[PDB]
C-alpha cells in the first residue's frame, strides 16, 4: 500500500486527484504552505524541509502551482523553484515515480490542430512558458537523475464547485438564469474532467518506471455555443441562452488535443464526456 | 545612422557585435551594470531601461548569466531583464530586436542534424531559461507587435577568452566574429520574426580541434545544427571554417 504526496493537495484538481488515490487503496498524503480525515504535512517548498515532508512517501503528484496576474514571468519563478526543490527532494529520499501537471497551454498554433505531443511548445502565456520550463527541468532530473516524471498536458479542466465561464454558465444556469456569449464563435476548446483527470494521474502513477510527456483530454472539442446549451439542458434551463453581439466573437482561439499516446501508453480513456459530466456535477450542487 | 543598444555590449560576443555594429556603418550602444563606443549604465529595471533607450533603433540583447549551481533560480534574472528589456523596447517603438539563444535548446543524438523544427530538449538549467526567453521574445512579437528574432547560436571561439579551445563526437563551433556577422544579418531584417539557427557547418570532435590548431600555430555529446533557415530568410552563411578562423587568432596573438 503506497503513500503518495499530493503538491497543492487542497486544490481544485488537487481535491479530485486526493480521493482516486484513497479510491485506489492508496494512501494519500497532503502538502500545503498551511491549513486552517487525510494526512496533512505542512511544508515550505524548501529543500531542506521537502526532503523531510517525503521521507516515507513512495510517489509524488505534482500539483502545485500560481495563476499569475499580471502577465509577468516573475510571478511563476517561485513555481520553477518549488518544482526543483521538489525533485532535488525526491532524488534524496529515492523517489522517481512522479506525475506533473501540464497544461493544453503549452500549445497556440491553431494551423496545427489537433497537436499531438510531437506540436512544437508555442505559449500565448507567460503561464504556459513556466508550466513548459517545469517540464523541461523534470525531463532533465528523469535523464540525468533516473528519475521518473511523467508530464501531463490536461485539456481544459471543468468540475463541480469552483467565476471562469464554464462555472458563470454552472452557477447562472443553475438558478435558471439567462446564459449570453459575448458574440457567436467556430473556435473548438477542449474540457477535461476533473474526475477524469484525477483519473490519468492514477493510470500515469501505474507506470512507475515511464517518463515522458502525455495530453490528457477528453475527447472533445465543444464551442461556446455548444457548452452553453449542455449545461442549459442538464440544469432544466432549456433554450435560455443569448448571444449579446452579432458576428464573429474573435477574442477566443481552437485548442483541443490530440490523445492517443495517453491511450497506448497509459492505457488511459476518460470515463465522461462533456454531458454526462455535468449531467453529474448538476445533480451534486444540490449541496 | 542608427543607433543599435547592445545589452553585454561588454562581454566576449558583446566586442565582436559591437565593432561589427560601427564597421556596417552604425552606431553602437553598449549598456552595461557598471563601468568598473557610447556606454550606458543600467540597473536593467524597466523604468531606467525605458529612458535609456529613447534614442535607439534596434536592440541585440547579448545580456546573460552563465550559472554556476545547476539551478533554474540562478537564471530567473536574466527572464525578468528580457520581459523589462522588451517592454522597454515596445514602450519606444522598437521592434527590431535580436536574441542571443543557444544551440543548447536541443540535446537528442537521435535528430542530428538539428533544425528549428525539432522539439527543444534542454540539457541544463541554462538551455532551459534560454528557450525560456526565446519564448518571451515570441509572445511579445505575435501580439505586441516586436519583431524578436532569437538566434541560436553554435559554440563561440575567438580571440582573448581556459575552457578547452582556449587552453590550446562532434561539436560545431562558430566563430565569435561570424556569430557577430549574422547578428547584423539578422538586423538587415528588421521585419522578421522566428528563431534561428546560426551554426558553420563545423562540426569538429575534439581530435580535430586539437589538430587544427597545431598545424596553423605550429605546435561529451553530439551536436551541431541545420542552418538551411538563415541562409535562406536572412542570407547568413559564415566567412571562416575552422581552419581559416584559427589561422587568424593566431595572427592577432602575436602583438
Ligand atoms: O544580469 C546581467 C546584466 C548584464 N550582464 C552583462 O553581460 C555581459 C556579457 O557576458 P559574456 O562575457 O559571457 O558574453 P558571451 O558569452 O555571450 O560572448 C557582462 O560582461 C555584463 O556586463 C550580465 O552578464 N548579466
Redesign the interface.
Known sequence: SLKIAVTGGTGFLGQYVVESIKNDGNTPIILTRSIGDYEYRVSDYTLEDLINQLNDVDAVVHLAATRGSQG???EF?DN??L??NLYDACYENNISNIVYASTISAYSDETSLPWNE?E???????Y???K??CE??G??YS??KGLCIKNLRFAHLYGFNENYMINRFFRQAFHGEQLTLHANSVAKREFLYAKDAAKSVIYALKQEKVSGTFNIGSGDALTNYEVANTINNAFGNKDNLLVKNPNANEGIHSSYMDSSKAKELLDFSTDYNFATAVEEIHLLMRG
Open positions: 509577468k514571468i516573475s519563478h520553477e523553484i518544482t526543483q510531437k512544437l511548445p508555442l505559449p500565448d502565456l507567460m504556459g512558458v513556466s513548459l520550463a523541461h527541468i525531463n532533465i535523464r540525468k
